[PDB]
């Protein structure tokens, strides 16, 4: 009963959740109305997998999810869409205004009056669960709701449950492309919550996925749907070990134990190797060695940072489909001899391997090809510091003149908090600069 | 009548145990349902060693399956020989150790050890005259290392006189499936050296080398490695189940192979291995078995014997053969390779002969070596341990469960002392 | 270091008196001769110890070695020699009913006292003689026993569990949660010894009605300070004096132990063998580098093979002075056992360790900072 609770906050969270639940329903053969005729035809099995779906008396399967937002529009789209019957009607939506890209508005003033009810529903879900593994929180840096309400929610969750694992999937601001003027303020404010309370957070950049779509899938005018589908594939690869049998199964505790050297350095990158279109799926062997090599390419990373400028501190490979341990062994041996990939001298092993028999599924109307073999990598490295550094500069350029600060302080936020928040990132940045130094 | 109680912990231990129970079951003609459909009388002469009689004239293996994750139990039950094991011996919990030795030893396993010992105490009480135990577990993981070491300690407190075997898989030099292998390996080796009578060292690198170079398999899987290991385990205890010219229980090996109490780490091997198509060329004879036994690449431990000296070795032959040929072959192996055997142990080759070979073969042989080269393995692990302990790479995961740096220091010191003790005799001219 | 193998012969015993009571041990000065009862014609086995003693005829004075003579030849000499920063290890190696306690304790009420009364009272009188405003001392004691590779506390109340042996990275092996005490006077040491001796496990056998089935250890940690602060540094000395009693080898043919007794005897013999091996090895090692060439390539001493040698790692060798009292008997039944004891003595009696330790960092830090 390897259960885990999904929470979605903000527009980005809700849309990524839509993609994720489409993928999950496709994976387990659950109809959009919650029925599973495959089990009726077969007559038995554990296809009502408890990792995501709770099975009621009549055979309907309710997902273990809590969508949260302040804009009625995004949730109302789900409540009258294809999957209107799938979710429990309690969708946790505020019939009021929204944070409007304001951390203080979403954390102090309007974040209240919804936190109690959301926590009540989360506790109600947790009561039904046995042997809960952890929480998967989807949100986005920059947005008012996804920053402030996520901060409040994670603080309360750390107070209440504490020991249970918590994983963040988030959309970090990009180096140049942005859809708001006050993104740096929100990110710099929410660093404290994503640093102190979360156990492991993955950063995702929009331009990285756009470049992947342009180069690999040959999509020329992608929208958010394709990015959400790729992120859903990432999350499914992460969570596959809990659902299906495999030669080497890696649950969440092993993953955290291997990828996190120190408490404050839990910011790994993520990537997916066999991202390829159906047209280009041919003319390609797509062996284990090829996908393992492709995982290391700087171009295929999901965050705009060059791993060559940093040091690899830990890795975790999760394979799916027709994979044999000998080929993974050979690929890792080939990788270790490459000189472009530098490993910190205090981690001689620096690899975790997981293999699963269930191959990835193909969503109808998607862009990814059907492949009998795939691998998803998580890599804890020191290059991520660069991704923070640029943002810090931007924040300074806006804080020297106190631009837009009156909006934040008008919602009960104290000015000095801004400075404090910046200091945290500085300290965090310094930690990376200390951990990559070779021993003497 | 001499009974062996079998224990298996962790994923690797459970897999090897399942394959081993398939192999032994064939030798003694046991159906998957438990009924006996053999031909020879000798198959039932000593069935009691590994099996208990049931009231319905069916045989239940005397095994304890242990884990902290129901997945491996479910995999074992839903298998070709899943129904053979009795359901009461499936002892497990939830929230597995997850490659954390402290969780396996202190936090999680301590809650489950009581239940496990209870089954063991029951199984043991039924036996007429218990010889010893044997445990299968990989040292690289959390559940295996932790719960195996804890069970070994508890059993040695409870049963000091009996024998304690161990078929453990060490971390490999190059291949590494986990990031925190050295910590678990060091702590497990610290626990094993004090509370065991024998310990057979197995390495996945060596087994893959055997599969590629010798057997010429193209795409080996864990099934083949478990096949090799299970062949070795069945070879070791052959003399307690069939007659022969010279018998040799587990103790007779322990006495003949262990000169000093702390040197009980053995390198196993098996012969023949004809690679599925070359058997028609080579003629199976005793000298061929000796040659393939004493070959360097045939060892399962990934340590070259030629880099050290043989403290003492044992050869268990199975089949109809002459004693003169065996004795002269062992003498010739001693005399030819005079520099690879110590000088203060004359005639350091134990020999046992059984006259009931495996079903598909005319002859076979099992090799157990005790050399000084094994220290290399530990030395390697020690280096990696230091490389992660100077900076405390992943220490916060362990210290959160109650351990402290002092225990790591004790483990490192004990491992280094063992390495020095092994290096004491690897020299020339004194 | 040293081992000063006190080869001592006690009066006869009822078990011996039942047989032909004829002593087979004689001497002349430092020369010790032992006759073969089965081959009296043969020249007696001859040894040259400076510390061989004969107390089978107590009232005699001609060539008679009183306990005061033993203390003068070993006790105060070893004490003063090791007083300049050493660890002193006195232990009793012998056989069952071989009079291993009268060496260790002796007649407390009489002036014919064992090694511990003389040593402890002499040390206590010494510190009292040098007790002053600017000269002070501090003494601590501890007691423990090894049953069968398991450590137990005798001073502390009944703790049915076994103490866990740990290894401090700098301070070496020690016993976790072992009860340790501070002591002011000699009579307190006597009372603690009485309590500890009562606490130990004891069982009866043919060779001795009250044989001890455990290996007992008695540690003394003794610190000395002088406080001439103008031109002297406090806590200028510390010493470790370890007094250990070792159950003798169980001659199973001469005892006929059965059941648990046999098991105890088995463990005892195993432990003793390991100890003997260490005493044989250590000697040779310290004989080689000190005499031969100064190479110091590498030498391994098997400490870890047993708990006794493991806990006494600091005291048995390395940087410690030692001492053995070979408690013999004049019987013919014990000739082979006596020969084994003195053959291990031939593999002992120098040990040759080095030391000089115990400064006061904080007190000199006053001068350094000023
Ligand atoms: C045509 C022919 O010669 O067939 C042989 C054969 O080719 C060889 C290659 C067999 C074959 O073994 C393998 O191919 C193999 C593959 C991976 C790992 C291990 C073995 C054989 O499968 C193995 C089989 O032997 C047995 O079955 C033994 O009794 C073995 N039992 C099992 O393998 C077994 C497997 C599942 C269930 C029950 C038993 C055994 C060995 C030691 C102790 C007890 C049992 C034999 C003679 C053969 C085949 C069939 C090809 C060999 O088997 C052994 C015992 O190692 C490989 O080395 C020998 C040499 C044989 O010549
Ligand atoms: N990958 C991806 N990113 C998205 C998506 N939708 C929004 N984003 C990101 O989210 C940022 C906007 O912040 P949001 O979290 O959506 O703000 P919100 O959730 O509506 O909360 P408010 O700020 O109060 O409106 C944009 O800059 C986008 O980069 C999406 O569908 N996919
Ligand atoms: N020099 C001596 N003069 C008089 N009596 C002595 C002398 N030496 C020993 N004894 C006596 O002889 C006995 C020796 O003690 P004993 O009963 O053998 O204990 P023990 O043998 O040391 N116990 P153990 O050796 O550990 O099994 C005691 O009764 C002593 O009083
Ligand atoms: N030979 C063999 N080795 C295995 C098998 N499964 C896992 N291993 C090895 O065991 C190690 C992982 O240990 P694991 O079984 O997870 O320990 P646990 O988690 O405590 O149960 C890896 O290094 C693998 O090489 C198997 O079926 N056969
Ligand atoms: Mg919004
Ligand atoms: Mg005595």
Q: In chain B, what are the domain boundaries? A: 2-259, 260-373, 374-430
* Residue written as token pair 């094993």: B192
Taking CA atoms, B359 is separated from B225, B267, B352, B355, in Å, by 20, 25, 19, 12
Task: Select from A261, A331, A336, A437 the residue whose CB has the most chain B CBs within 10 Å, as the one to mutate to test that interface.
Answer: A261
Query: Is residue B226 within 6 Å of ligand 4 at its C-beta?
Result: yes
Asked if residues A170 and A145 have their Cβ atoms less than 8 Å apart, the reply is no
Residues A376 and A354: their CA atoms lie apart, in Å, by 10
Question: What is the assigned CATH class of domain B2-259?
Answer: alpha beta
Given the structure tokens 């200028």, which residue do they identify?
C236
Nearest CB among A248, A326, A345 relative to B177 is that of A248
A254 is catalytic: yes
Using CA atoms of B280, B283, B286, B291 in order, give the dihedral in degrees to the nearest 10. -80
Cα A13 to the center of its chain, rounded Å: 10
CB neighbours of residue C276 within 10 Å: 18
Residues flagged as binding site of B for Mg(2+): 11, 177
- Domain A384-440: CATH architecture, name and number where available: Orthogonal Bundle (1.10)
Q: What is the CATH number of domain B260-373?
A: 3.30.1330.20
Q: Which of A9, A146, A168, A222 to mutate to test the pocket of ligand 2 (most atoms within 8 A of CB)?
A: A146
Which residue among A258, A326, A350 sits closest to B99, beta carbon to beta carbon? A258
Ligand 3 within 6 A of CB of C265: no
Distance from the C361 Cα atom to the nearest Cα atom in chain B, whole angstroms: 25
Residues 6+ apart with CB under 8 A from A56: A62
Joined together, the tokens standing for residue B17 give: 């145990």
- Chains A and B, touching by 3 or more CB pairs within 8 angstroms: yes
The full set of domain ranges for chain A reads: 1-268, 269-383, 384-440
Write the burial class of residue A324 (CB in 10 Å: 0-12 exposed, 13-18 middle, 19+ buried): middle
> Tokens 């899938």 correspond to what residue?
A217
CA C53 – CA C64 distance, rounded (Å): 8
HEC-encoded secondary structure of chain A: CCEEEEEEEHHHHHHHHHHHHHHHHHHHCCCCCCCCHHHHHHCCCCCCCCCCEEECCCCCEEECEEEEECCHHHHHHHHCCCCCCCCCCCCCECCCCCCCCCHHHHHHHCCCCCHHHHHHHHHHHHHHCCCEEEEEEEEECCCHHHHHHHHHHHHHHHHHCCCCEEEEEEECCCCCCCCCCCHHHHHHHHHHHHHHCCCEEEEECHHHHHHHHHHHHCCCCCCHHHHHHHHHHHHHHHHHHHCCCCCECCCHHHHHHHHCCCCCCCCCEEEECCCCCHHHHCCCCCCHHHHHHHHCCHHHCCCCCCHHHCCEEEEEEEEEECCCHHHHHHHHHHHHHCCCCCECCCCCCCCEEEEECCCCCCCCCCCCCCCCEEEEEEEEECCHHHHHHHHHHHHHHHHCCCCCHHHHHCCCCCCHHHHHHHHHHHHHHHHHHHHCCCCC
* DSSP-based three-state secondary structure for B267: strand
> Across the strands, what pairs with A165?
A134
Using CA coordinates, name the residue in chain A closest to B386.
A346
What resolution in angstrom units was achieved for this structure?
3.1
In the structure, which protein residues have their CB atom closer than 6 angstroms to any atom of ligand 2?
A 10-12, 15, 70-71, 98-101, 106, 140, 142-146, 171, 179-180, 206, 224, 227-228
Contact A225, A19 (CB under 8 A): yes
- Phi first, then psi, for residue B314 (nearest 5°) are -140, 140
Question: Six-digit token pair at A117?
Answer: 């009810």
Q: Are the CB atoms for A149 and A111 separated by under 8 Å?
A: yes
Helices (H), B309-366: 323-336
End-to-end CA distance of chain B: 46
Length reported for chain B:
430
- If we measure between CA atoms, which residue out of B213, B210, B97 comes closest to residue B146? B97
What kind of architecture, by CATH, is found in domain A1-268? Answer: 3-Layer(aba) Sandwich (3.40)
Query: Which of C278, C300, C310 would you mutate first to test chain B, the one with the most B CBs within 10 A?
Result: C300
Ligand 3 geometric centre to CA of C98 (Å): 7
C153 labelled catalytic? no
| Calpha distance A385→B413 (Å, rounded) | 38
Technique behind the model: cryo-EM
Are the C-beta atoms of residues C2 and C78 closer than 8 Å to each other? yes
- Would you state the torsion angle of the CA atoms of residues C66, C71, C72, C74, taken in this order, to the nearest 10 degrees? 120
For B56, the token pair is 């319905």
Interfacial residues of A (vs B; Cβ cutoff 8 Å): 1, 131, 245, 247-249, 251, 253-254, 257-263, 314, 324-326, 329, 332-333, 345-353, 439
Q: Please name the residue that has the structure tokens 């004689």.
A: C26
Atom of ligand 2 nearest to the CA of A105: 24
Q: What CA dihedral angle connects A271, A272, A278 and A280, to 10 degrees?
A: 70
The rounded distance, in Å, linking the Cα atoms of C236 and A295 is 65
Write out the DSSP string of B134-173.
EEEEETTSHHHHHHHHHHHHHHHHH-SSSEEEEEEEEPPS
- The CATH T-level fold of domain A269-383 is 60s Ribosomal Protein L30; Chain: A; (3.30.1330)
Q: What is the CATH number of domain B374-430?
A: 1.10.287.600
Q: Is C196 a catalytic residue?
A: no
Mutant choice from B421, B429, B430 vs C, greatest count of C C-beta within 10 A: B421
Set of chain A residues whose Cβ sits within 8 Å of the Cβ of B180: 257-258, 349
How far is it, in rounded angstroms, from Cα A162 to Cα A158? 4
Q: How many whole angstroms separate alpha carbon A153 and alpha carbon A145?
A: 11
B397 → chain A, closest CA residue: A257
Q: Which two tokens stand for residue A85?
A: 């019957």
User: Based on the number of CB atoms within 10 Å of its own CB, is B55 exposed (0-12), middle (13-18) or buried (19 or more)?
Assistant: exposed
């Amino acid at each position: 009963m390897r259960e885990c609770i999904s929470i979605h906050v903000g527009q980005a969270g809700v849309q990524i959740g839509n993609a994720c639940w489409e993928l999950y329903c496709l994976e387990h053969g659950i109809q959009p109305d919650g029925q599973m005729p495959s089990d009726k035809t077969i007559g038995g099995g554990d296809d009502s997998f408890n990792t995501f779906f709770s099975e009621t008396g009549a055979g309907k399967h309710v997902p273990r999810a809590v969508f949260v937002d302040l804009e009625p529009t995004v949730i109302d789209e789900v409540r009258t869409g294809t999957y209107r019957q799938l979710f429990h009607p309690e969708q946790l939506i505020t019939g009021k205004e929204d944070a409007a890209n304001n951390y203080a508005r979403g954390h102090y003033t309007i974040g209240k009056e919804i936190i109690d009810l959301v926590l009540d529903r989360i506790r109600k879900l947790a009561d039904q669960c046995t042997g809960l593994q952890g929480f998967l929180v989807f949100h986005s840096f920059g947005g008012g709701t996804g920053s402030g309400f996520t901060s409040l929610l994670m603080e309360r969750l750390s107070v209440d449950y504490g020991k249970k694992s918590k994983l963040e999937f988030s959309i970090y601001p990009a180096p140049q492309v942005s859809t708001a003027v006050v993104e740096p303020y929100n990110s710099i404010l929410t660093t404290h919550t994503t640093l102190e309370h979360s156990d492991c957070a993955f950063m995702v950049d929009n331009e990285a996925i756009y470049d992947i779509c342009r180069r690999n899938l040959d999509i020329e005018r992608p929208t958010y749907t394709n990015l959400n589908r790729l992120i859903s594939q990432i999350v499914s690869s992460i969570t596959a070990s809990l659902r299906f049998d495999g030669a080497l199964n890696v649950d969440l505790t092993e993953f955290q134990t291997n990828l996190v050297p120190y408490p404050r350095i839990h910011f790994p990158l993520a990537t997916y190797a066999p991202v390829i279109s159906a047209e280009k799926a041919y003319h390609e062997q797509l062996s284990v060695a090829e996908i393992t090599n492709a995982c290391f390419e700087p171009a295929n990373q999901m965050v705009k940072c060059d791993p060559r400028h940093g040091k690899y501190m830990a890795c975790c490979l999760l394979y799916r489909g027709d994979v044999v341990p000998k080929d993974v062994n050979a690929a890792i041996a080939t990788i270790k001899t490459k000189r472009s990939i530098q490993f910190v001298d205090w981690c001689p092993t620096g690899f975790k391997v997981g293999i699963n028999y269930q191959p990835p599924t193909v969503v109808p109307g998607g862009d990814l090809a059907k492949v009998q073999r795939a691998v998803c990598m998580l890599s804890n490295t020191t290059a991520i510091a660069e991704a923070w550094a640029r943002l810090d500069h931007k924040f300074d350029l806006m804080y020297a003149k106190r631009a837009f600060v009156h909006w934040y302080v008008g919602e009960g936020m104290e000015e000095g908090e801004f400075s404090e928040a910046r200091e945290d990132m500085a300290a965090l940045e310094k930690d990376y600069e200390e951990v990559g130094v070779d021993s003497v | 009548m001499r009974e062996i109680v079998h224990i298996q912990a962790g994923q690797c231990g459970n897999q090897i145990g399942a394959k081993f129970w398939e192999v032994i079951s064939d030798e003694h003609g046991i159906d998957p349902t438990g009924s006996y459909h053999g031909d020879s009388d000798l198959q039932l002469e000593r069935i009691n060693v590994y099996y208990n009689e049931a009231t319905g004239n069916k045989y239940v293996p005397r095994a304890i399956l242990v884990d902290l994750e129901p997945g491996t139990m479910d995999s074992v039950r839903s298998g070709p020989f899943g129904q053979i094991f009795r359901p009461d011996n499936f002892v497990f919990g939830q929230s597995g150790a997850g490659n954390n030795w402290a969780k396996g030893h202190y936090t999680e396993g301590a809650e489950l050890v009581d239940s496990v010992l209870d089954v063991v105490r029951k199984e043991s009480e039924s036996c007429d005259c218990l010889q010893g135990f044997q445990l299968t577990h990989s040292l690289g993981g959390g559940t295996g290392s932790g719960m195996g070491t804890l069970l070994i300690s508890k059993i040695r407190e409870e049963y000091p006189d009996r024998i304690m075997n161990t078929f453990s898989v060490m971390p490999s030099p190059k291949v590494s499936d986990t990031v925190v292998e050295p910590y678990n390996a060091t702590l497990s080796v610290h626990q094993l050296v004090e509370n065991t009578d024998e310990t057979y060292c197995i390495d996945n690198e060596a087994l893959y080398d055997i599969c590629f170079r010798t057997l010429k398999l193209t795409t080996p899987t864990y099934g083949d490695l478990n096949h090799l290991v299970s062949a070795t385990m069945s070879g070791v205890t052959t003399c307690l189940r069939f007659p022969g010219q010279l018998n040799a229980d587990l103790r007779k090996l322990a006495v003949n192979m262990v000169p000093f109490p702390r040197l009980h780490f053995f390198m196993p091997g098996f012969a023949p291995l004809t690679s599925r198509g070359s058997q028609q060329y080579r003629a199976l004879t005793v000298p061929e078995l000796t040659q393939q036994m004493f070959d360097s690449k045939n060892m399962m431990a990934a340590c070259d014997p030629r880099h050290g000296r043989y403290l003492t070795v044992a050869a268990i032959f199975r089949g109809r053969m002459s004693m003169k040929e065996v004795d002269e072959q062992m003498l010739n192996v001693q005399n030819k390779n005079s520099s690879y055997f110590v000088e203060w142990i004359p005639n350091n080759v134990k020999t046992a002969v059984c006259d009931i070979p495996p079903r598909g073969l005319k002859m076979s042989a099992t090799f157990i070596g005790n050399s000084t080269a094994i220290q290399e393995l530990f030395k390697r692990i020690s280096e990696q341990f230091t490389a992660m302990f100077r900076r405390k790479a992943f220490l916060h995961w362990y210290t959160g469960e109650g351990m402290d740096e002092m225990e790591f220091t004790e483990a490192e010191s004990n491992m280094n002392d063992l390495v020095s003790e092994y290096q004491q005799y690897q020299d020339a001219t004194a | 270091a040293s081992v000063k193998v006190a080869v001592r012969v006690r009066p006869f015993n009822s078990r011996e008196m039942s047989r032909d009571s004829k002593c087979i041990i004689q001497m002349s000065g430092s020369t010790t001769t032992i006759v073969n009862p089965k081959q009296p014609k043969e020249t007696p086995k001859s040894f040259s110890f400076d510390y061989s003693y004969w107390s089978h005829t107590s009232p005699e004075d001609i060539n008679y070695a009183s306990q005061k003579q033993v203390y003068r030849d070993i006790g105060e000499e070893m004490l003063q020699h090791a007083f300049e920063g050493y660890n002193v290890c006195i232990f009793a190696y012998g056989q069952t009913g071989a009079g291993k306690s009268y060496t260790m304790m002796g007649k407390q009420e009489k002036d014919q006292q064992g090694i511990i009364p003389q040593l402890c009272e002499d040390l206590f009188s010494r510190i009292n003689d040098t007790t002053n405003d600017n000269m002070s001392y501090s003494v601590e004691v501890s007691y423990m026993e090894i049953y069968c590779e398991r450590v137990r506390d005798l001073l502390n109340p009944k703790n049915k569990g076994n103490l866990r042996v740990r290894e401090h990275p700098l301070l070496g092996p020690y016993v976790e949660d072992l009860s340790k005490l501070a002591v002011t006077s000699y009579n307190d040491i006597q009372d603690l010894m009485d309590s500890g001796n009562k606490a130990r496990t004891v069982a009866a056998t043919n060779m001795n009605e009250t044989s001890s089935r455990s290996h007992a250890v008695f540690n003394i940690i003794f610190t000395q300070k002088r406080h001439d602060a103008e031109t002297n540094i406090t806590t200028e000395k510390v010493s470790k004096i370890s007094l250990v009693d070792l159950a003798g080898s169980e001659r199973a043919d001469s005892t006929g132990a059965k059941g648990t007794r046999l098991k105890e005897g088995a463990n005892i013999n195993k432990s003793l063998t390991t100890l003997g091996k260490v005493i044989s090895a250590l000697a040779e090692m310290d004989s080689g580098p000190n005499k031969n060439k100064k190479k110091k390539k590498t030498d391994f001493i098997p400490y870890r093979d047993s708990v006794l040698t493991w806990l006494l790692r600091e005291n048995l060798g390395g940087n410690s002075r030692t001492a053995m009292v070979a408690a013999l008997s004049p019987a013919d039944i014990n000739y082979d056992e006596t020969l084994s004891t003195l053959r291990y003595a031939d593999r002992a009696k120098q040990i040759r360790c080095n030391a000089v330790i115990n400064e006061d960092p904080n007190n000199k830090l006053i001068r350094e900072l000023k």
